[PDB]
Subunit: 476 residues, 2 copies
């Protein structure tokens, strides 16, 4: 259906300018000084408000398994929540069941999302084990299924953990396929050692989670992953950056040569781990995620600073909350608490408040860290993350001047708690458009279950492999 | 005049793609897979070669006065050499006399460039002293003449040097006018002291120029510049970054918040100061520029790496050589040697060889550091530094695999020496187009004296001031 947005200020990552935008059949058809559309056309008066590209959440775990329980917000509830918060595309993590192949898991996820997602989506495939034959499936996932990104774990001893030798093999094989390599960086062996010790001191509450996974163990894994990537000459992406230490490791590496990217999430940009010490067991348990929120209160402002100067490039949510009932399964042993916090709905609002409202970065840089950088890294650029003729009509009309107190009573998540409870933000979504259709307006959501399309991605993203290709020919 | 570039691979700072480009009347009229062109239109077959935005040399001193003499390459010779090197625009520094009229010097520089320049140009206005009434003239240059950039000096005691009180006053006023504040950062008092001391010892050769201006003095001046800018909350641009020390200061400051931009030049990116110790006085004196080339051999590679990671954003040449006979006006006292080196013609080839051919950055980042970044900072963005419909037709067909050994025996400058003598680079221009007209093709240059237009620029470049505005409203 034809839709005209008039009087708006278009904000892309490279510049801002006034013009109207004309949408038709999921595409941006025209941008220009004034008029040019048929007489019958629904019209939205932006009246000076910002017209920006819909957000791309590079990290979601909507159907994540944890302690035998599935994350609380499914593909429907989850994407509905995303759209209400201004995010029009997600890249969800496929997590294979024990003893299941990668192709079987992809098919399960794909079928699931296709029947419930309210918006467009892509899929990451989590390689939980380097088994004989995995190489063939990966080739099929890249070449035929359209999956260009994969994650390997450095933590979760005896479960998902990959040894240095296996990590070297995986990075090498993945680079050959032109894939984007993601890492969950925490030293699992040392974490296992600390869990035992902490539980021995009689510490059973959530604070035990933070205490068994100190940031020094995250930073160390990040460094080791960067060392491997550097020897292999392949890009490496660090998911869920939660600490000042890990962030500095990445910063230092960037000026050295290694092609390393950093992904902080809403949680680490908007709150901290002091809440693991709440008297209320349920509130504390709701903050349990891995890596954990840093107990150092200076962390959120510091990570935002690094995102502003370019040492960190994209923002995600790591969304995968569990209800109090599900969390309670470990009311006694903190190591039995399902891991995951909310943030898919709050991401763009939280980033705007902590980065733009404070003056650390401007609106153009806001677009880059919420969509454009993500698009260039995962090979979806022009199509997504840019208001331009020919791109997909995933648009948001943002109003920098007002409204937003984050509360569990008004959020879209099905869970009881919210790690950003009480946070008042200045700047939020007014109108959300996906696939050329209005899904959020006048403070209300209007979605269609299953309307979302799966977006396949080609390997060898230029932003990543151009430098890789030169280096392989210059340093042989 | 109509011109079609066919079969090329367009390279912008944000992406690359195959499409033909159609030029008409100084503008890029169409970009696309094919078709839509009149029969009698001159066509160029790119044959898969790179089609990029013409370079922008943010730093030129074509009519610079020094020791009572004028620089060797004037507006005609200088721009001719720039075009031959792939640079289609320069922003030259107007250098006013002893407390004379800024407006009058502007008028003189403008008249010369409009009569001699081969390509479009803009003008910087150097504030050689804060004489009473300078404010009034500055306001006119900005609002009426279209000058949005001004440079202040921290060196040259009793000549151009401004005190901290004056610097503070100038940054504050210039911020008020929304200008881009450039700084020549070296501690003039300490340099004056060391010059005396070095001469007293009997060291009068060019090595004394380097010895009397150690990088510790450039770094301290740079640090102090940023400190003032932080208190005032205004953007600050560091011209001619020549040392690792100075580059590290800027890098640390970027993570802290202050809006600081760094400008390394061809000289510091492609050679070093070991040549000041050359037996050949003439050769050594040819390297005399301030700040001086660093004697540390590791400097060029280091600066290139920080340019690639984003700590330094633009590249200039600082072109303003003097013939040997002119330099020789101080063969018995290095303090009387006219300051200035070559680089305007070599800039893009040198940057390509040190940054892209080594794999530190790819072709898109190359475009950013040679034109686009400069365009955004100086408010010339969409029109310059981008291959898009509506932008000026300043284009270059670049061949990534075609050697070019730089020699004074064949360079376009008029001077006898070349600081890049013997350097063999792998990447040079094949065709250069200015204002939609071919000025370089088949190895031959064809330019029209006085064809270049003066490009006026508006104050308050969004890229710089959006953040400034937020900060002013949040930290009062």
């Amino acid at each position: 259906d034809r839709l005209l947005i008039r009087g708006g200020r278009i904000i892309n990552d490279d510049q801002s300018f006034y013009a109207d935008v004309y949408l038709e059949d999921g595409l941006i058809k025209q941008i220009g000084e004034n008029l040019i559309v048929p007489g019958g056309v629904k019209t939205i008066e932006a009246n000076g408000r910002m017209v920006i590209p819909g957000g791309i959440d590079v990290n979601t775990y909507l159907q994540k398994p944890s302690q035998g329980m599935t994350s609380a917000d499914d593909f429907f509830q989850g994407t509905k929540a995303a759209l209400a918060g201004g995010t029009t595309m997600i890249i969800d993590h496929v997590v294979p069941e024990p003893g299941s192949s990668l192709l079987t898991s992809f098919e399960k996820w794909h079928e699931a999302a296709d029947t419930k997602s309210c918006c467009d989506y892509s899929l990451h495939v989590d390689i939980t084990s380097w088994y004989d034959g995995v190489r063939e499936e990966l080739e099929v996932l890249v070449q035929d299924k359209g999956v260009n990104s994969f994650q390997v774990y450095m933590a979760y001893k005896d479960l998902y953990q990959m040894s240095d030798s296996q990590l070297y093999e995986a990075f090498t094989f993945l680079k050959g396929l032109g894939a984007v390599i993601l890492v969950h960086a925490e030293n699992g062996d040392l974490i296992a050692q600390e869990q035992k010790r902490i539980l021995e001191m009689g510490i059973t509450g959530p604070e035990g989670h933070a205490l068994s996974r100190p940031e020094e163990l995250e930073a160390e894994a990040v460094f080791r992953a960067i060392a491997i990537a550097g020897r292999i000459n392949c890009p490496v992406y660090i998911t869920k950056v939660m600490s000042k230490s890990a962030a500095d490791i990445i910063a230092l590496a960037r000026k050295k040569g290694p092609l390393v990217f950093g992904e902080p999430i809403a949680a680490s940009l908007g709150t901290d781990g002091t809440h693991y010490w709440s008297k209320n067991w349920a509130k504390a348990a709701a903050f349990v995620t891995s890596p954990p929120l840093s107990p150092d209160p200076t962390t959120p402002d510091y990570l935002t600073s690094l995102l502003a100067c370019g040492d960190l490039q994209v923002t995600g949510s790591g969304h995968c909350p569990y209800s109090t009932a599900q969390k309670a399964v470990g009311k006694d042993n903190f190591t039995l608490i399902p891991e995951g916090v909310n943030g898919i709905e709050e991401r763009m609002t939280v980033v705007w408040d902590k980065a733009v409202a404070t003056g650390k970065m401007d609106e153009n840089q806001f677009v880059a860290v919420t969509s454009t950088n993500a698009a260039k890294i995962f090979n979806l650029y022009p199509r997504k993350g840019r208001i331009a003729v020919g791109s997909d009509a995933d648009v948001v009309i943002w109003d920098p001047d007002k409204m937003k107190t984050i509360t569990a009573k008004s959020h879209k998540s099905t869970v009881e708690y919210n790690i950003f409870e009480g946070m008042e933000c200045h700047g939020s979504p007014l109108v959300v458009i996906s696939q050329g259709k209005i899904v959020f307006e006048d403070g209300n959501i209007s979605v269609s279950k299953g309307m979302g399309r799966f977006i396949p991605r080609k390997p060898f993203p230029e932003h990543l492999y151009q430098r890789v290709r030169i280096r392989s020919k210059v340093f042989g």
